[PDB]
Design a protein around this nucleic acid. Structure first.
Lengths: 56, 209, 142
RNA sequence: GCUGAAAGCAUCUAAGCACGAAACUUGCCCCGAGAUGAGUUCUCCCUGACCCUUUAAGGGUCCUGAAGGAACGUUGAAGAC
RNA sequence: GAUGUCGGCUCAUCACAUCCUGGGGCUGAAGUAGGUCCCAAGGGUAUGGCUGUUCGCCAUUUAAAGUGGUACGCGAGCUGG
RNA sequence: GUGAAGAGGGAAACAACCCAGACCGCCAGCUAAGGUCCCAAAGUCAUGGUUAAGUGGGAAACGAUGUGGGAAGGCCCAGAC
RNA sequence: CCCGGCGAGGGGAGUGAAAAAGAACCUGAAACCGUGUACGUACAAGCAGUGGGAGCACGCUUAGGCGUGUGACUGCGUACC
């Protein structure tokens, strides 16, 4: 139920070796708007694949 | 002898004139094309590598295309190897049809069993369920004891516990060959075979005999 | 001054070929272990592998005295509950003859990372032919 | 059990030879090259130009970015992730 | 300055002084069926009535309902008679 | 007598057994118990025998033409077994 | 003055001998948690050291074979009260 010995800082780091986050490989660029966005996601200005989806 | 690669179409029944219903699994065995022949001199053993079906040309990788191109055959959905019993001769590009099973009368069917995911001991190992009442506390389907006291202060290897069940290679032996339809590339075998509909199956003549 | 110590980057290792036909298993193994460790070299250093590469031919024809050919038993445990498996000397020779010499030498070598490295210099072959002619092994009448 | 001396005989044993069980090794099914002893076979891809120096399995710039992989998306009789 | 117990339940694992199945010698072994000893641990090896019981008696099965070790296996797995 | 209050070497590991009593330093030598084929420092040492059982490296009453050595005895080319 | 939400918190500027005295304010230790650099580390088993010891990095200083850091491999070695 509980530990018999205090795990080391080395053991703590070893467990956290798989906790590293992964950054997005790259961001797509809208063909017309030209702004960066997540692939398959609309841009911040409401564009997607150069179609100007609803932006209100 | 060598076997063939087919697809599990499904299950149906065959009504005999004597009033007997035979449960049959329909296996679609298209022509198997020999992509490579391995011999003792070069590979150290005798076998034939075959392919079946069709694959999108756009999705065939260049390393795979070159392998098919050398044999001069169209790409299939995969590659499988069959050992040769010291009396079989095959040539690259040869097509093997379901007629090979014409006079076999009994086959061994291998496939990937349906995946049950993370299964408990009751389902996976047929463990007996404990009492549903009479004071039982949160221990209705739990495994129970998993070892002995200090003397073997450890759990033995191979202990039956919960874990992945199914989705593994399984062979069912000695299945009667109900029908061999060369025209429709169909093979009917009495009984059920591993895997879901549309999965690949490896059919070989029965080894037990 | 300080006592000489061999450097692993400058130690010279030679290649030898030994015919095991008719040789007593144990008395052949001791010499192999001695030469694999480098005890026969004046530059011997306990923490350095100063031994020589040795090729053993005709391992299947090694000899054993007494009734050991049918009475010597090789035990090993697979790690499972049953686990315990055994094979006689004749069975080992028939199945994998090279393991007979390899097992004998391994026990006589030191235990640890270095001893494991020394064992890597031993090449045991069941037949009378080896494919190490490029190394120009020298016949060793051991 | 056979043949057969030590022991003129006898003797399944000492030399030699033949049978003999759900045990043993195989045969059947599954995993399996992290088997660091890391194996084999087939196929596919890459055929630039310079600089520095403690000059070597060295470092750096420009050009180049293949096979393939991953990522993302639609998803599955695959799946806790 | 704490190594929680009888029995039940769940899950077992080993030994062989073998209960069944397998191979044998002897028999006061005609056969069928037994007795005794040797080899053999691969697999298999009851459900119920009474009682907290283990055990035991009883009812009815089975090829057989083996004997022991494992903190009289197993309560950070259940139960609490 | 030793441990207790005693290290070192040996007995695989092993306070009490065997050898032996650590003031400090040395990359010098000789020995004790115990050892000298490899792990692992030193004899694959020399000479003459024994064992075939891995005895050596676990054990009794008792059983047996195993095998070595020694001192006698009975019957024997009037022919022994 | 600038970033920020007319924030929090910072970077400049300025005051001061000092702002690494900025009000969470003299000095600012240890546990504990980080960034950078050198070396070691993914076939190796245990009080983590000790004796031996290669390689690498760095410093030398009138090649001087030295110091410092690291520690592959190896003998011995089961904390303290």
């Amino acid at each position: 139920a509980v530990q018999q010995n205090k795990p080391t800082r080395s053991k703590r780091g070893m467990r956290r070796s798989h906790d590293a986050l992964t950054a997005v490989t790259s961001l797509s660029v809208d063909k017309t708007s030209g702004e960066k966005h997540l692939r398959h996601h609309i841009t911040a200005d409401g564009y997607y694949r150069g179609r100007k989806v609803i932006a209100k | 002898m060598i076997g063939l690669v087919g697809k599990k179409v499904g299950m149906t029944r065959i009504f005999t004139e004597d009033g007997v219903s035979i449960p049959v699994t329909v296996i679609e065995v298209e022509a198997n094309r020999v992509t490579q022949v391995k011999d003792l001199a070069n590979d150290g053993y005798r076998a034939i590598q075959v392919t079946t079906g069709a694959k999108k040309a756009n999705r065939v990788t260049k390393p795979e295309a070159g392998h098919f191109a050398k044999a001069g055959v169209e790409a299939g959905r995969g590659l499988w190897e069959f050992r040769l019993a010291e009396g079989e001769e095959f040539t690259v590009g040869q097509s093997i049809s379901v007629e090979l099973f014409a006079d076999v009368k009994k086959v061994d069917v291998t496939g990937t069993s349906k995946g049950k995911g993370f299964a408990g001991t009751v389902k996976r190992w047929n463990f007996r369920t404990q009492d549903a009442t009479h004071g039982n506390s949160l221990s209705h389907r739990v495994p129970g004891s998993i070892g002995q006291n200090q003397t073997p202060g450890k759990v033995f290897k191979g202990k039956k516990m919960a874990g992945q069940m199914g989705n593994e290679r399984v062979t069912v032996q000695s299945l009667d060959v109900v029908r061999v339809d060369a025209e429709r590339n169909l093979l009917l075998v009495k009984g059920a075979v591993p895997g879901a509909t549309g999965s690949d199956l490896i059919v070989k003549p029965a080894v037990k005999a | 001054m300080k006592t000489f110590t061999a450097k692993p980057e400058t130690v010279k290792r030679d290649w030898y070929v030994v015919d095991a036909t008719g040789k007593t298993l144990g008395r052949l193994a001791t010499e192999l272990a001695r030469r694999l460790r480098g005890k026969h070299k004046a530059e011997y250093t306990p923490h350095v592998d100063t031994g020589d590469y040795i090729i053993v031919l005709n391992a299947d024809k090694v000899a054993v005295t007494g009734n050991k050919r049918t009475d010597k038993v090789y035990y090993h445990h697979t790690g499972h509950i049953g686990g315990i498996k055994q094979a006689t000397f004749e069975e080992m020779i028939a199945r994998r003859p090279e393991r007979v010499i390899e097992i004998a030498v391994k026990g006589m070598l030191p235990k640890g990372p270095l001893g494991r490295a020394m064992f890597r210099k031993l090449k045991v072959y069941a037949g009378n032919e080896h494919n190490h002619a490029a190394q120009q092994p020298q016949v060793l009448d051991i």
